[PDB]
C-alpha cells in the first residue's frame, strides 16, 4: 500500500520474538565469535611488535596512555609493568622458533589477551591484517595469472607444487624442466614472476610468518567477525518491537514516527554491541535505556530548524512545567517575570530564551481572502538599493571628480590620497608625506585649504545639496 510505515511493521513482524533461553544462546555465540577474532589478533607477530613500538612512544611523550589501551583485565605505574610483562613474553617466544616454539608462542597469546584495546587501535590492527592479506593476494594472483592466462598453463597442475611452499624456487625453477606440455611455456614470463616474488617472500620477513599461516590466521578472524555480526544482527532483529513500543511515546515532539524508531534502532544496535549477558541484566530493560537515550538525544539535535544546545531545550521544557500549574493556580497566567523567580538563572533571560525557542513560521502560510497571496509574497527586500539613491551615487562621483579638477594638481592628489577616491585603500598623512617627499605637518596644512576651498561657496553650492 506504499506508506513505508506499513512496509516496515509487516516486514519486521516475520522475525519471531526471542525466548528467554534463545537470548543466552545468541549471546553465547557472540562471546565465541569475538574471542575468535581476539585470539586471531593474538597470533599476529606484527600486531605485538606494533603494540611494543607504540608503548615506547607513550613513555617517550610522543602519545598518551588514553589513545592506546583502555585498561587490562582489572594507572600509569600498573600500565608500565604490565607492558613489561608483554614485552618479556615477546622476547622469549621470538628466539625459540628453533618446532618446540609452539608451546611458548601459545603463552605469548595469553598475556596479550588480557589487553583491552581502544576500538580505534584494534580496527587499525585488523585493517593492517586485511591490507597485508591484500598485499599477499596481489602476488598470489599475479604469479597465477602470469602462468595460466598468459603462458597457457592449466590450473590443475599449477597448484600441485604450490601448496606448502609458494616461496622458494622448487615450483618456479624446478617445475619448468618437467617436459610437460605446460612446462616449456613457463620460460617467457620468468623474468616478470621471479622479480615480483620479492614482496611475496618479504611478507614472511616483516610479518615473521610463512605465506602458509598468513591465510589461516585472518581466515579464522574473518569467520569470527561474520559470526559476531550474524549473532548481533539476530539480536537486533528480535528486539525491534521494543523500539516500536518506546518510540510511540515521542510522536509529536517534532520528528516523524519512522525517524524516531530508526534512531531508536541505532540505539539498540549499540546496546547489543555493549551487552554482557554474564551480569544477569534482562536485555529488554538494558536496551530500553539506550534506545530511549538515542531517541531523545536525536530529537534534541536535528528536530529544529534552528539547532539549540541541550540545556536550552531542557530549560524550555522546565518553563512549560511551571506555566502548567501556574496557569490555573494563579487564575490568569504567571506574569512574564513570574516564572523567573521560580527558575534558577538571572531570570531576565526568560525573554531571550523564550524568543530563540520559538519555531519559525512557514513562509507559505496563507493569510486572507484565501487568495494566492501568501505570507512570503509580502516580504520586501531590504538589502537592495533604491535607484533614486544609486542615481545620486553615480552623480556624486562626477561631483567630487569635477570639484577636484578645480583645485591644484597636488591638492587633488593629496585629497584623493587622504580618502579612498579612485584608489585602493587610502593613505595616512605620513604615507602622503613619503609619496610627496615634503613631509609631516606641511602636507596637513594643504589639506585644510583644500577642504577650505570647497567650503566657501562657489564650489560648495553643488556639493552641499547631497546632505539632507
Amino acid at each position: 500500500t506504499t506508506d513505508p510505515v506499513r512496509m516496515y511493521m509487516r516486514e519486521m513482524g516475520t522475525v519471531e520474538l526471542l525466548t528467554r533461553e534463545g537470548e543466552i544462546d545468541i549471546a553465547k555465540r557472540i562471546e565465541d565469535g569475538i574471542n575468535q577474532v581476539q585470539c586471531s589478533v593474538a597470533e599476529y607477530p606484527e600486531a605485538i611488535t606494533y603494540l611494543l613500538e607504540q608503548y615506547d612512544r607513550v613513555e617517550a611523550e610522543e602519545a598518551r596512555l588514553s589513545d592506546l589501551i583502555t585498561g587490562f583485565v582489572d594507572d600509569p605505574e600498573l600500565a608500565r609493568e604490565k607492558f613489561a610483562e608483554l614485552r618479556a613474553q615477546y622476547v622469549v617466544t621470538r628466539d625459540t622458533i628453533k618446532a618446540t616454539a609452539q608451546e611458548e608462542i601459545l603463552k605469548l597469546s595469553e598475556v596479550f589477551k588480557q589487553f583491552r584495546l581502544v576500538p580505534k587501535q584494534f580496527d587499525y590492527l585488523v585493517n593492517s591484517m586485511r591490507v597485508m592479506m591484500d598485499r599477499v593476494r596481489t602476488q598470489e594472483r599475479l604469479i597465477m595469472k602470469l602462468c595460466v592466462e598468459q603462458c597457457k598453463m592449466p590450473k590443475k597442475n599449477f597448484i600441485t607444487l604450490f601448496t606448502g611452499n609458494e616461496t622458494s624456487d622448487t615450483w618456479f625453477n624446478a617445475a619448468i624442466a618437467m617436459n610437460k606440455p605446460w612446462s616449456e611455456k613457463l620460460h617467457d614470463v620468468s623474468e616478470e614472476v621471479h622479480r615480483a616474488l620479492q614482496k611475496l617472500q618479504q611478507i614472511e620477513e616483516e610479518t615473521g610468518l610463512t605465506i602458509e599461516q598468513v591465510k589461516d590466521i585472518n581466515r579464522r578472524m574473518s569467520i569470527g567477525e561474520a559470526k559476531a555480526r550474524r549473532a548481533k544482527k539476530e539480536m537486533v532483529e528480535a528486539n525491534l518491537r521494543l523500539v516500536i513500543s518506546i518510540a510511540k511515546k515521542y510522536t509529536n515532539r517534532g520528528l516523524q514516527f519512522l525517524d524516531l524508531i530508526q534512531e531508536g534502532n541505532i540505539g539498540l544496535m549499540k546496546a547489543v554491541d555493549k551487552f554482557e549477558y554474564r551480569r544477569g541484566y534482562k536485555f529488554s530493560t538494558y536496551a530500553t535505556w539506550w534506545i530511549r537515550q538515542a531517541i531523545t538525544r536525536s530529537i534534541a539535535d536535528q528536530a529544529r530548524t534552528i539547532r539549540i544546545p541541550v540545556h536550552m531545550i531542557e530549560t524550555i521544557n522546565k518553563l512549560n512545567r511551571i506555566s502548567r500549574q501556574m496557569l490555573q493556580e494563579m487564575g490568569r497566567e504567571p506574569t512574564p517575570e513570574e516564572l523567573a523567580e521560580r527558575m534558577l538563572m538571572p531570570e531576565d533571560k526568560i525573554r531571550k530564551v523564550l524568543k530563540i525557542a520559538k519555531e519559525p513560521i512557514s513562509m507559505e502560510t496563507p493569510i486572507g481572502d484565501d487568495e494566492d497571496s501568501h505570507l512570503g509574497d509580502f516580504i520586501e527586500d531590504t538589502t537592495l538599493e533604491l535607484p533614486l539613491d544609486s542615481a545620486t551615487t553615480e552623480s556624486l562621483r562626477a561631483a567630487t571628480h569635477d570639484v577636484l579638477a578645480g583645485l591644484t594638481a597636488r591638492e587633488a592628489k593629496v585629497l584623493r590620497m587622504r580618502f579612498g577616491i579612485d584608489m585602493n585603500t587610502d593613505y595616512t598623512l605620513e604615507e602622503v608625506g613619503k609619496q610627496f617627499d615634503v613631509t609631516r605637518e606641511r602636507i596637513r596644512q594643504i589639506e585644510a585649504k583644500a577642504l577650505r576651498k570647497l567650503r566657501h561657496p562657489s564650489r560648495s553650492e553643488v556639493l552641499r545639496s547631497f546632505l539632507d
Binding site: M269, R307, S465
Partner: protein, 1166 residues
C-alpha cells in the same frame, strides 16, 4: 571567426535529463549538515543548507569571518573560512548538491500518468514500486537459465533459483535494481525486434501500444538521454536565497517549506551512510532506504504519495513541483500576472471639454509618476543643482516644478486601462492634461469602448517610458488611431446618450414655431436668429446652403441651392465638413443615423477629418442638450385610458376558460396554455396602446384646427433618439409589466397587472424578485463563462499572425446573402465588405470585368456591385490561404481601426479571439453555450447520418440492433455497408439514389462528417453561418473574418492515409505535411507525396498541441508537459508569442516582427 564562449544573446532553449556529473557541475559544494544558522550569531553554519562557503556571502562584498571587508578585495577566497567576497546576489544563483548513499527514483518519471520508467522498460507500474519498496526481487539480464529478463520473483523462488543457478543469473531489488535495468537496456536492439513484430500481427490492441512505444524509444535514443539518469545519484539543492530564512519584527523568523524538506533528505541520507559503516541488519537499512525514497519524493513533488505536513502546521508543505505548478500552471505569466512600476489608479470622472485624444490627469499622480523625468529635466535646464536638490525640490513642491511638469507631460502619452479588459480598446493612449483634484477625467466618446460607467469604476494609468513605447502608444495605442471596432468596421466612438439626445432635439420639427416659413442666407444668420431668441430650434424653413460633392476626380465640386429643412439642421450644418451632402443632416438624426454619419465621414474624407468631426458632435451635443432643458417628470409617462378595461376583458377570458375546465370541456394542461395565452395577448394590447398614445398624441394647431405629429414628450424623445430606454423598458413603466416566472421555469398565469408608474403590491414585487435574482445571477455567471471562452479562443489562436504578402491562391469561399426563409436576414454587401475577390466577376454579359480579379472591395466597389444585380461573389478567406505558419495579408481583409488593408505583421489571432469574446456577455439550443459547443466540434446527442458515398442504396440483413444499409455505386465498387440502428426513424428512401452527404435521417449532424463528406469549405461555411446566427439573433455585429481564423486553427491538423515518407495514421500539421509533399512533388522521390485527410479538432483539443513546450507548460498540466518534453530532449526555438512573453523579449509580431525576421534569417545561415 570563433562562435563564442561567453555571454552573447541566446536563441532557443534545450531540455533533457541531468547526469549525476552534470548535477555536480552546478554544485559549488556538498551540503553535509541539516544546520541552518548558528542560533545565536545568525551567521550560516558551514556545510549546511545555508552556507557562505558553498553558496555565498551574507552581506555585499564582505567575507563571513570578516578578514577581507574591503570592496577592492573580490576574487579572494578567505584563508580562514573560504568565502569568495562578491555581491550577495550570487547567493541567489549558486546551486549545490547532495550525494545519496543508495540510488533513488525520480518521482516525476515514476508517477507521471504514462509512467516513464514503466513503459520504457515495458514493465508495469505496481511491479516497479514493489521492487522499489524491497517487497520482491526482479530479474536483470537473465542469461540462459530459467528466467525472463523482466520477471519478478519472491523470497523462496529467488532462493531456489540461486541454488539451482549460482552464477550466470542475477537479481536485485530496490532502486539499484531499476538503475541496473535501465543501464543494461540497449535501446537500439530493442527497436529492431519491435519493428518486426509490428508488421507481423494485425490487432488494434497490439499495434496502438506498439506504435506509441516505438516512437518513445527511437525518440529517446536520438535525444541523448541515457536511461540511468532517471535514477538519481546526486540531488541538486536550490540556492539559499530562493528559499530564505529572513527575519521579521519581534525577532521571529520565517522560511520557505523547502528547507524542512531539504533538511529531511540530508538527515535520512546521512543516517543511511552511518548505517552502512555500522553493518546494520537488512531489515533496517531497507527501511532507511524506503524512508529516504519517501523523503526525496516529498521534496520533488509532494502529494503523489502521502502529502507530508510541515512542522507544527497541518497544511502540507509546498514542494518544488507545487512551486512551478498552480493556477494555472506557471504564475510567472498566469493570472495574475506580476506587479509593475510607474503606474497608479483612481476613480474616474467625465471632463466633457476634453478633445478625444487627451485625458484629465490628477496633479499628484503625475508628480509621483514622472518623478525620474522631473529629476532629469530639472538639472538639464539648471533649476536644480544636482539630482538630490531636485528630489528636495519636488518633495518640497516648490512652485517652479509645476511648469517643468507641463513640459514633460505635453508630448508624452499615457496608457489608460479599466478592470475587465476584453478587446484591445480596453487600453488606449491619451495625452495628459494637468488637472487639479484626485479624479481621472475620461473623454465621453471613449466611455463606450471601455464599457466604463461613472458609478465608481476605477481606471489604471501606465507611463510609456522608452521612446519606442511613446511612438508605439502614439502611432498604435493612441485614442484617435482606433476610432473603429476591430470586430467590425463600424465606429465604436459613436456618441452615447446625452449627445445623441441633443442632436435629436436639434434636428426635429414641430408643426408651428417661431420663425416658421422665413428664409435665411446661410447657417451663420440661422444661428444668429436662434441664439437671439427670434426663431425656434425646430421650425420648417428654407435656407440657402452650399453643399459639396467630391464626385469629380479627387476634386471637390460645389453646389448651392435652397434646401427645405429646419433651424436646427441649418445650425448643425456648420459642423459637417466639405464634401458631405446636406442630405445626411436633413433627417431627424437618431442614434442610428448619427453613427452612419461619422462612418460615412470616415470612409469618405479619411481619418483626420473624422476625429475633429467627432469632437465637434460631442461638444455641440452637450451644449444644445443643456439648452433643451430635457427632464423626466411623473406625468411624462402616460398610461392608456383603456388599460383597466383591457385587464377586465382579458379577465373575462380566464373566467370563461375556467368555466370550461370545471365542466371538463378542456383539459388541465390546455387550460394553462390558454390562460397564459390570453394574458400574453393582453400585454401586447396594452403595449401597443400606450405606444400609439405616447408616440403621436401631441396634437397641435397650425393656422387651422388640429394636426398630430410625433410627441415632444421627454421620455419618448429619449427612447426614439436611441439615447436610452426601449419599448420593453418603456412598456414596464406605463403598461403592465410581463408575466413573471416561478423558480422552476414555469410562468405564472396571473401576470403583473400593474406597473412602475402605479404601485406594485406585496405579491407582484415578491414574484418580480425571481426575475431580478436570476438576472443578476445569470449575468454574473455568464460574465465568468464569457471570459473562459475567450481564454480557450486566445489559446487556440494566439501565434497566428499575418506573415507573407500574397500566398497567391485562387481559392476562397462563396459569399452569398444569408437569405433565411424570408427576405435577407443580412445582406451581401455586409458579408463581402472589406474582403478581397477570389476571381474577376461578370456583369450579366461578359468580357466586361467590373471588379478585376483580386481587389479590396471598398464602399465604391460595393455600391457598383449593388447598381448591377450581381447576387454572388467568391471571396478569399483565411481558411483557404496557402501560406504555411500564418496568413497572407492578401487573403485576410482590410478590417482594422483603419480602413486600409491589413498591415504586414499585425497579429490577427488575438484580435479575432477578442472580437468574438467581448460580446459574449450579451448572449443567453440557444445562447453562449451553443457557441461553445460549435467551437468544440462536439457531436450532438441524437445526430443524423449522411450518405457515405453516392449511388443507389438499399436495406440489408435484419434486426440485430442495426439494420444494415447497402450502397451500390454505379461505376465504383459496392462494398460500403453501414450499421444503422433501425429503431431510429429514417428519412432516406429505400429505393432512391443518395449523393454522398445527403440526408439519411433527420436531426443535427456532426461537423466531422461535413468536413469529411462535404469538404472544408462546406464545414467552415456551416460553422460561420451557425455561430453568426446566434450572435446576430442577439444583435451582435461580428465580421465573419474572426470566426474564419478560429476555424482555420481548428483544422490545423490532419491524419495521413498513404505513405512513402512518414507513418500511416499519424495526426500531423497540414502546414508541415503540405509543405512536405510540395517539397516532395519534385526532387527527392519523383513524387512519393503522401495523401492526408483534413481533420476537425475542437478548440480546446487543437490548442493542446503546440510545438513550443514553454507555451504548453503554461496553461496545461505542468508536470506532464515538462516530463513528456524532458525525455525527448525537445528544443524550444521560441518563435511564438506566449513563450517570448515568459522569457521577456520582443513579441515576434507588430513592432517586434522586424526583429525576429532579422534574427530568424541570421539563424540556420553563415
Amino acid at each position: 571567426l570563433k562562435a563564442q564562449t561567453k555571454t552573447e544573446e541566446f536563441d532557443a532553449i534545450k531540455i533533457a535529463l541531468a547526469s549525476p556529473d552534470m548535477i555536480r557541475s552546478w554544485s559549488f559544494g556538498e551540503v553535509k549538515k541539516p544546520e541552518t544558522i548558528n542560533y545565536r550569531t545568525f551567521k550560516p553554519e558551514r556545510d549546511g543548507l545555508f552556507c557562505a562557503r558553498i553558496f555565498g556571502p551574507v552581506k555585499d562584498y564582505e567575507c563571513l569571518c570578516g578578514k577581507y571587508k574591503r570592496l577592492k578585495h573580490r576574487g579572494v577566497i578567505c584563508e580562514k573560512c573560504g568565502v569568495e567576497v562578491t555581491q550577495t546576489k550570487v547567493r541567489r544563483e549558486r546551486m549545490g548538491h547532495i550525494e545519496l548513499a543508495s540510488p533513488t527514483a525520480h518521482i516525476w518519471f515514476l508517477k507521471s500518468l504514462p509512467s516513464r520508467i514503466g513503459l520504457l522498460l515495458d514493465m508495469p507500474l505496481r511491479d516497479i514500486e514493489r521492487v522499489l519498496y524491497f517487497e520482491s526481487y526482479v530479474v536483470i539480464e537473465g542469461g540462459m537459465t530459467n528466467l525472463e529478463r523482466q520477471q519478478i520473483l519472491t523470497e523462496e523462488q529467488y532462493l531456489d533459483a540461486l541454488e539451482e543457478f549460482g552464477d550466470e543469473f542475477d537479481a536485485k531489488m530496490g532502486a539499484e535494481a531499476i538503475q541496473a535495468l535501465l543501464k543494461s537496456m540497449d535501446l537500439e536492439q530493442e527497436c529492431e525486434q519491435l519493428r518486426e513484430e509490428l508488421n507481423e500481427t494485425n490487432s488494434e490492441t497490439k499495434r496502438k501500444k506498439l506504435t506509441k512505444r516505438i516512437k518513445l524509444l527511437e525518440a529517446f535514443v536520438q535525444s541523448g538521454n541515457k536511461p540511468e539518469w532517471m535514477i538519481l545519484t546526486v540531488l541538486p539543492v536550490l540556492p539559499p536565497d530562493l528559499r530564505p530564512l529572513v527575519p521579521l519584527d519581534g525577532g521571529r523568523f520565517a522560511t520557505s517549506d523547502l528547507n524542512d524538506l531539504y533538511r529531511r533528505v540530508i538527515n535520512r541520507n546521512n543516517r543511511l551512510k552511518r548505517l552502512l559503516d555500522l553493518a546494520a541488519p537488512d531489515i533496517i537499512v531497507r527501511n532507511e532506504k524506503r524512508m529516504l525514497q519517501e523523503a526525496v519524493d516529498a521534496l520533488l513533488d509532494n502529494g503523489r504519495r502521502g502529502r507530508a505536513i510541515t512542522g507544527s502546521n497541518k497544511r502540507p508543505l509546498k514542494s518544488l513541483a507545487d512551486m512551478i505548478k498552480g493556477k494555472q500552471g506557471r504564475f510567472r505569466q498566469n493570472l495574475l500576472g506580476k506587479r509593475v512600476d510607474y503606474s497608479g489608479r483612481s476613480v474616474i470622472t467625465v471632463g466633457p471639454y476634453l478633445r478625444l485624444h487627451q485625458c484629465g490627469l490628477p496633479k499628484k499622480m503625475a508628480l509621483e509618476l514622472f518623478k525620474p523625468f522631473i529629476y532629469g529635466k530639472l538639472e538639464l535646464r539648471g533649476l536644480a543643482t544636482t539630482i538630490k536638490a531636485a528630489k528636495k525640490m519636488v518633495e518640497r513642491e516648490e512652485a517652479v516644478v509645476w511648469d517643468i511638469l507641463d513640459e514633460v507631460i505635453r508630448e508624452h502619452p499615457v496608457l489608460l486601462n479599466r478592470a475587465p479588459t476584453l478587446h484591445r480598446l480596453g487600453i488606449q493612449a491619451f495625452e495628459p492634461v494637468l488637472i487639479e483634484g484626485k479624479a481621472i477625467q475620461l473623454h465621453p466618446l471613449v466611455c463606450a469602448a471601455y464599457n466604463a460607467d461613472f458609478d465608481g469604476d476605477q481606471m489604471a494609468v501606465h507611463v510609456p517610458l522608452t521612446l519606442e513605447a511613446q511612438l508605439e502608444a502614439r502611432a498604435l495605442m493612441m485614442s484617435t488611431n482606433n476610432i473603429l471596432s476591430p470586430a467590425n468596421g463600424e465606429p465604436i466612438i459613436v456618441p452615447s446618450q446625452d449627445v445623441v439626445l441633443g442632436l435629436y432635439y436639434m434636428t426635429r420639427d414641430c408643426v408651428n414655431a417661431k420663425g416658421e416659413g422665413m428664409v435665411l442666407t446661410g447657417p451663420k444668420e440661422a444661428e444668429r436668429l436662434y441664439r437671439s431668441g427670434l426663431a425656434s430650434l425646430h421650425a420648417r424653413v428654407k435656407v440657402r446652403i452650399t453643399e459639396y460633392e467630391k464626385d469629380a476626380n479627387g476634386e471637390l465640386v460645389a453646389k448651392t441651392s435652397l434646401k427645405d429643412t429646419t433651424v436646427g439642421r441649418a445650425i448643425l450644418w456648420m459642423i459637417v465638413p466639405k464634401g458631405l451632402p446636406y442630405s445626411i443632416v436633413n433627417q431627424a438624426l437618431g442614434k442610428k443615423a448619427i453613427s452612419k454619419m461619422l462612418n460615412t465621414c470616415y470612409r469618405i474624407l479619411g481619418l483626420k477629418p473624422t476625429v475633429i468631426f467627432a469632437d465637434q458632435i460631442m461638444y455641440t451635443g452637450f451644449a444644445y442638450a443643456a439648452r433643451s432643458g430635457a427632464s423626466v417628470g411623473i406625468d411624462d409617462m402616460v398610461i392608456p385610458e383603456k388599460k383597466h378595461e383591457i385587464i377586465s376583458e382579458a379577465e373575462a377570458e380566464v373566467a370563461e376558460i375556467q368555466e370550461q375546465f370545471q365542466s371538463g370541456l378542456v383539459t388541465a394542461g390546455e387550460r394553462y396554455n390558454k390562460v397564459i395565452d390570453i394574458w400574453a395577448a393582453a400585454n401586447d394590447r396594452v403595449s401597443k396602446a400606450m405606444m400609439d398614445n405616447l408616440q403621436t398624441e401631441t396634437v397641435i394647431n397650425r393656422d387651422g384646427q388640429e394636426e398630430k405629429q410625433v410627441s415632444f414628450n421627454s421620455i419618448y424623445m429619449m427612447a426614439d433618439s436611441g439615447a436610452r430606454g426601449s419599448a420593453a423598458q418603456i412598456r414596464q413603466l406605463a403598461g403592465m409589466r410581463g408575466l413573471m416566472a416561478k423558480p422552476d421555469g414555469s410562468i405564472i398565469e396571473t401576470p403583473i397587472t400593474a406597473n412602475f408608474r402605479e404601485g406594485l403590491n406585496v405579491l407582484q414585487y415578491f414574484i418580480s424578485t425571481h426575475g431580478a435574482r436570476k438576472g443578476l445571477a445569470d449575468t454574473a455567471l455568464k460574465t465568468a463563462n464569457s471570459g473562459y471562452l475567450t481564454r480557450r479562443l486566445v489559446d487556440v489562436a494566439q501565434d497566428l499572425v499575418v506573415t507573407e504578402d500574397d500566398c497567391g491562391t485562387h481559392e476562397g469561399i462563396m459569399m452569398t446573402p444569408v437569405i433565411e426563409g424570408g427576405d435577407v436576414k443580412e445582406p451581401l454587401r455586409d458579408r463581402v465588405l472589406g474582403r478581397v475577390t477570389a476571381e474577376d466577376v461578370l456583369k450579366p454579359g461578359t468580357a466586361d470585368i467590373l471588379v478585376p480579379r483580386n481587389t479590396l472591395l471598398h464602399e465604391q466597389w460595393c455600391d457598383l456591385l449593388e447598381e448591377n444585380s450581381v447576387d454572388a461573389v467568391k471571396v478569399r478567406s483565411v481558411v483557404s490561404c496557402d501560406t504555411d505558419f500564418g496568413v497572407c495579408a492578401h487573403c485576410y481583409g482590410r478590417d482594422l481601426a483603419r480602413g486600409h488593408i491589413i498591415n504586414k505583421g499585425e497579429a490577427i489571432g488575438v484580435i479575432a479571439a477578442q472580437s468574438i469574446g467581448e460580446p459574449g456577455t450579451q448572449l443567453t439550443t440557444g445562447g453562449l453555450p451553443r457557441v461553445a459547443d460549435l467551437f468544440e466540434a462536439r457531436r450532438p446527442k441524437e445526430p443524423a447520418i449522411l450518405a457515405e458515398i453516392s449511388g443507389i442504396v438499399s436495406f440489408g440483413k435484419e434486426t440485430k440492433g442495426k439494420r444494415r444499409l447497402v450502397i451500390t455505386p454505379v461505376d465504383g465498387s459496392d462494398p460500403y455497408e453501414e450499421m444503422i440502428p433501425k429503431w431510429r426513424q429514417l428519412n432516406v428512401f429505400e429505393g432512391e439514389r443518395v449523393e454522398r452527404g445527403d440526408v439519411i435521417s433527420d436531426g443535427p449532424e456532426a461537423p466531422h462528417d461535413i468536413l469529411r463528406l462535404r469538404g472544408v469549405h462546406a464545414v467552415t461555411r456551416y460553422i460561420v453561418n451557425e455561430v453568426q446566427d446566434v450572435y446576430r439573433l442577439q444583435g451582435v455585429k461580428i465580421n465573419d473574418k474572426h470566426i474564419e481564423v478560429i476555424v482555420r486553427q481548428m483544422l490545423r491538423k490532419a491524419t495521413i492515409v498513404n505513405a512513402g515518407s512518414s507513418d500511416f495514421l499519424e495526426g500531423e500539421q497540414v502546414e508541415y505535411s503540405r509543405v512536405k509533399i510540395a517539397n516532395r512533388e519534385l526532387e527527392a522521390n519523383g513524387k512519393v507525396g503522401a495523401t492526408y485527410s483534413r481533420d476537425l479538432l475542437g478548440i480546446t483539443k487543437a490548442s493542446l498541441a503546440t510545438e513550443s513546450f514553454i507555451s504548453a507548460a503554461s496553461f496545461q498540466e505542468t508536470t506532464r508537459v515538462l516530463t513528456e518534453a524532458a525525455v525527448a530532449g525537445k528544443r524550444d526555438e521560441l518563435r511564438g508569442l506566449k513563450e517570448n512573453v515568459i522569457v521577456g523579449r520582443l513579441i515576434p509580431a507588430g513592432t517586434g516582427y522586424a526583429y525576429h525576421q532579422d534574427r530568424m534569417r541570421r539563424r540556420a545561415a553563415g
